[PDB]
Design a protein around this nucleic acid. Structure first.
Ligand SMILES: [Zn+2]
Lengths: 165, 350, 377, 108, 54
RNA sequence: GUGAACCGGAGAAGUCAUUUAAUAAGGCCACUGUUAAAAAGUAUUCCCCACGCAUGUGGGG
């Protein structure tokens, strides 16, 4: 896609003031506070009116908030299941590993509205283990096409491939 | 050229061609349609009963050479079938098991006299009675009269003029197509060969059912040299249309201006110079919309409308500003925008 | 004539039914994962409650000899009671335990008076207790759930004659399914040592599992079967129907309730009289998803009303219509979105709903059918 | 589910009572739509109704079982029933594009 | 003349046909396993019914 | 009318009981938004229609 790449580049073009504006609004909707709505509209609407396959409003809002609180540099080949597999194959397999596995597996039963907080938990686990990179574009596409079966199959397959190295 | 052979396609979700080893309770398919099986299908096509067929119609029909090509060789599935005696008189229940061939396809070629083949093909286009595959609980999934006849040659040549149909893109295929053919006389090899098996599928009578042995030979075929792989038609996977609206193609850019002239440059609810257009019914987008699907609005009212339908879960029927039920919420959102917006942020972002 | 009850309920975070692994019971419906309460849980939790106390005329146990022993006040005949029961046909499964027998609490006196009798033998004693067991099918709970008692015969010496021990059920309870997708969650607990001085440290994180869901519940009672099951008592059948409705409205399965305490109430009860049974579970093949402003219960009731209207307009026949009442607590949740009303009544009190149901069924009154009292104990 | 009825065989079975044959066809059309198997319905109570019935008249017999050669996968803006009906519609469209005319129009 | 009837019917979690073991009856089609209600079960429900008796 | 036709694997069942994730931490040190303007002493006001045509009067968007 190209709307996603432009959206991510625009998000990384922000400075500390607008990042703080987005950071103050975690856990909130889009139609609540005017400064957040204005910032997100001015960042997203030209891309939507240009590219027909730009990310939807809810997905783009969720990625904007996650980037605000969990600022990671954009890199290719650093998807969420790969990093979760790399982290998960370092703990004992009796107590901690089933807990982290259950936390990762909760995401399959949630829709796109109720997914900011588990993703925040996963990214907090990533940040606790000295991670400084993430693939925002691939995560945005996966969240955009989520209720399908092949996307979840590829998600779990990438997790298994990272876990069984 | 007069037709010589006749083609029959036998394919269904379930089918079963019984064999002689089914004697008491367990009923087994052999591997493929038998001569007696297909010559009950042809008899039921021309409406010949169980009587009056043995003396006249069966001897002429049994004077044929037929061969079966097998694709999707089928997976045998067993069924626990109970027959309730009572509901002699007893409350007993009889148990049995019946075998079916799941996901199978067979191509039968019957070669013989021309006008007999023409009569058979004319009968198959509108059968007199119901046509099934072995047992009455198994209807075909593809039409039996699907391939045209012709003045072909011996059965190996007749089993090569039909393409191998597929169903979806990644459909796995076999490299080998086994085929089962009737043995052929000719007085050079007058005695039966070593690799010939014996099948009990030569029908004589049907009401006191009578079958006779028939020598059966086996051969093979390879895809790409004898049969050419065909392709599926139509669309299998069904998806809703769900056309995401586009604001860059020419058709929408002209429809939007036409709507902006239909309403005389005035926002609908607050009556200010309109600068944008908001959709109501979304099931026309992509460049096919009508001017009655669109409503003219200004920046403040369209921002209020966008706020009012962010996470409301509306798929095709969005907010209609002309509706007098949405007036209060739009006015309240407009008041909030007027009270809390900052022009400096928007001017700085662009 | 069939009386059907469709209920919409929403439950607090709890665990009302668990499998062998402890996780809450789930199922698959519409290609997505739901949450399930098994039908045998609902039936047991309804029939064992403070609202069904007067009609608990049945018992289900393997220790019938213990019942015989406790029915008397002496040293009794406990060993030969078990020997007689072994002679009956309730043989030990792999030389262990017994077979479940459902029987009325009334006829145990006949068992006590027959087994203790010394003017007979073991074979005649076994035949007599079999005869009195086969004629213990008069109880309100046995008239709904139904019975099927069949010995394995491995111990049938062609000396004990058996009879029609099967009772056709009158009540069909469906498995409760959630109206939305299922979101299970894990509660993490640590048992704390009361002594302040531990002088040790080790992780002992436990694992408990719970979930919250909006359940759709479906019941069905055959009125003509209940008359035959209760031999022709209209008053007892009406009392059982009313008490079952009142119990099902205000009871919950007593699962992990001392730690979760999720005694919630239904937000909608629709009672319909029909000629053929119909289930409205197809309303929720599309799962209910929350939006910017919505109750989960309001959206579920709206989907139910949409499908009910579609079925009523689609499967309509003037030979046998359907008339139904819709109950919500003080009309909190109307059937629909204040549009396309279908229900012939709108009750706002549960007692009035049960009274109207009884009035349509036989013209009885709830204060009138309470006089038909079964075994209480 | 698929059903077939032979009109000529039924008429010969009734030897000419065409009104009785029509009444039996109507009775079966009602019964096969509003009857369910009795297996374990006292514990599960799956008294559901058809979500669409298509009655067709044609010369050769056929079954639209090849429509669901791909298992139905559910998406966000659909349920299982609508997608099954959509696949049936696509197969009917393909069949009427391929097998039609020949002085024999089909009726749905 | 050949009247054909096609139906699409979604069912609640149930067990309408059984093997000799107790599982629901299944079959194979398209590369997966599919739940199946047998032909002779459906014919027995249509026959001997109160609708077909009235 | 096809080892085929005719054909239910059916009746039945609470996984219930017990449990704090607890004890602790400053996000700290530095930064002009600067340089500019008559809503008015003009020389064509963006379009249509009545009249006789001395840098002509009336009427309507
Ligand atoms: Zn406006």
């Amino acid at each position: 896609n190209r709307g996603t790449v432009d959206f991510i580049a625009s998000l990384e073009n922000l400075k500390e003031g607008d990042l703080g504006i987005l950071r103050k609004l975690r856990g909130a909707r889009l139609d609540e506070k005017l400064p957040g709505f204005d910032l997100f509209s001015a960042l997203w609407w030209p891309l939507r009116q240009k590219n027909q396959r730009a990310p939807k409003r809810e997905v783009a809002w969720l990625i904007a908030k996650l980037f605000a609180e969990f600022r990671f540099e954009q890199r290719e080949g650093a998807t969420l299941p790969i990093l979760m597999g790399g982290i998960c194959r370092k703990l004992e397999p009796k107590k901690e590993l089933p807990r982290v596995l259950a936390r990762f597996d909760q995401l399959a039963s949630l829709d796109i509205m109720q997914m900011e907080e588990p993703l925040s938990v996963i990214m907090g686990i990533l940040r606790k283990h000295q991670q400084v990179c993430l693939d925002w574009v691939g995560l945005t596409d996966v969240l955009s096409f989520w209720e399908q079966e092949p996307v979840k199959r590829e998600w779990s397959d990438s997790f298994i491939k990272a876990y069984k190295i | 050229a007069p037709p010589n052979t006749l083609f029959l396609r036998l394919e269904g979700a379930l089918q079963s061609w019984g064999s002689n080893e089914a004697k008491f309770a367990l009923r087994r398919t052999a591997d493929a349609p038998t001569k007696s099986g297909v010559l009950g299908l042809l008899c039921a096509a021309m409406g010949i009963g169980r009587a009056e067929a043995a003396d006249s119609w069966l001897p002429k029909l049994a004077n044929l050479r037929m061969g079966v090509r097998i694709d999707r060789p089928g997976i045998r599935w067993w069924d626990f079938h109970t027959v309730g005696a009572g509901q002699k008189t007893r409350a007993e229940t009889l148990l049995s098991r019946r075998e079916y061939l799941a996901d199978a396809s067979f191509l039968v070629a019957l070669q013989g006299e021309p006008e007999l083949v023409a009569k058979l093909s004319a009968a198959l286009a509108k059968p007199v009675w119901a046509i099934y595959l072995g047992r009455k609980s198994c209807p075909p999934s593809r039409p039996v009269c699907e391939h045209p006849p012709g003045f072909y040659n011996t059965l190996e040549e007749a089993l090569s003029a039909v393409p191998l149909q597929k169903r979806w893109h990644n459909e796995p295929l076999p490299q080998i197509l086994p085929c089962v053919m009737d043995w052929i006389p000719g007085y050079d090899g007058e005695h039966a060969p070593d690799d010939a098996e014996i099948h009990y599928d030569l029908p004589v009578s049907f009401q006191p059912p009578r079958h006779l042995p028939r020598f059966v030979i086996r051969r093979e075929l390879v895809v790409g040299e004898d049969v050419q792989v065909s392709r599926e038609t139509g669309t299998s996977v069904w998806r809703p249309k769900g056309t995401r609206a586009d604001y860059n193609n020419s058709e929408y850019k002209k429809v939007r201006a036409e709507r902006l002239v239909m309403d005389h440059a005035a926002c609908m609810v607050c009556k200010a110079p309109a600068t944008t257009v908001q959709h109501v019914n979304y099931r026309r987008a992509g460049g096919k919309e009508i001017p009655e699907d669109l409503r003219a609005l200004c920046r403040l009212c369209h921002d209020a409308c966008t706020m009012l339908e962010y996470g409301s879960g509306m798929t095709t029927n969005r907010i209609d500003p002309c509706d007098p039920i949405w007036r209060e919420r739009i006015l309240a959102k407009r008041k909030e925008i007027v009270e809390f917006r900052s022009r400096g942020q928007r001017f700085r972002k662009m | 004539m069939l009386i059907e009850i469709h209920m919409i309920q929403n439950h607090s975070p709890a665990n009302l039914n668990r499998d062998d692994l402890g996780a809450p019971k789930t199922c698959y419906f519409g290609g997505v994962l739901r949450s399930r309460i098994s039908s045998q849980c609902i039936k047991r939790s309804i029939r064992t409650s403070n609202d069904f106390k007067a009609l608990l005329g049945g018992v289900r146990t393997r220790r019938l000899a213990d019942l015989i022993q406790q029915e008397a006040g002496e040293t009794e005949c406990w060993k030969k009671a078990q020997e007689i029961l072994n002679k009956c046909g309730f043989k030990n499964k792999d030389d262990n335990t017994k077979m479940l027998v459902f029987m009325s609490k009334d006829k145990i006196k006949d068992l006590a008076r027959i087994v203790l009798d010394n003017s007979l033998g073991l074979t005649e004693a076994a035949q007599q207790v079999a005869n009195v067991i086969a004629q213990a099918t008069l109880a309100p709970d046995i008239a709904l759930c139904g019975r099927m008692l069949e010995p394995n015969d491995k111990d049938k010496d062609k000396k004990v004659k058996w009879s029609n021990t099967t009772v056709e059920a009158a009540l069909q309870v469906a498995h409760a399914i959630s109206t939305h997708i299922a979101r299970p969650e894990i509660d993490y607990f640590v048992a704390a040592d009361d002594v302040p001085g531990e002088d040790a440290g080790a992780g002992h994180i436990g694992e408990s599992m719970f979930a919250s869901a909006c359940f759709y519940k479906y019941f069905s009672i055959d009125w003509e079967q209940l008359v035959k099951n209760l031999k022709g008592d209209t008053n007892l059948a009406a009392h059982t129907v009313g008490a079952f409705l009142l119990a099902a409205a205000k009871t919950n399965p007593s699962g992990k309730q001392n730690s979760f305490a999720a005694h919630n109430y239904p937000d909608g009860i629709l009672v319909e009289f029909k000629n053929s049974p119909i289930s409205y579970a197809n309303a929720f093949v599309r799962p209910v998803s929350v939006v910017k402003e919505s109750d989960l219960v309001e959206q579920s009731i709206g989907q139910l009303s949409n499908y009910v209207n579609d079925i009523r307009l689609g499967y309509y026949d003037e030979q046998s219509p359907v008339i139904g009442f819709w109950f919500s607590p003080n009309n909190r949740y109307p059937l629909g979105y204040k549009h396309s009303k279908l229900a012939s009544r709108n009750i706002g009190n549960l007692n009035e709903l049960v009274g109207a149901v009884l009035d349509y069924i036989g013209g009885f009154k709830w204060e009138e059918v309470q006089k038909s009292k079964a075994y209480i104990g």
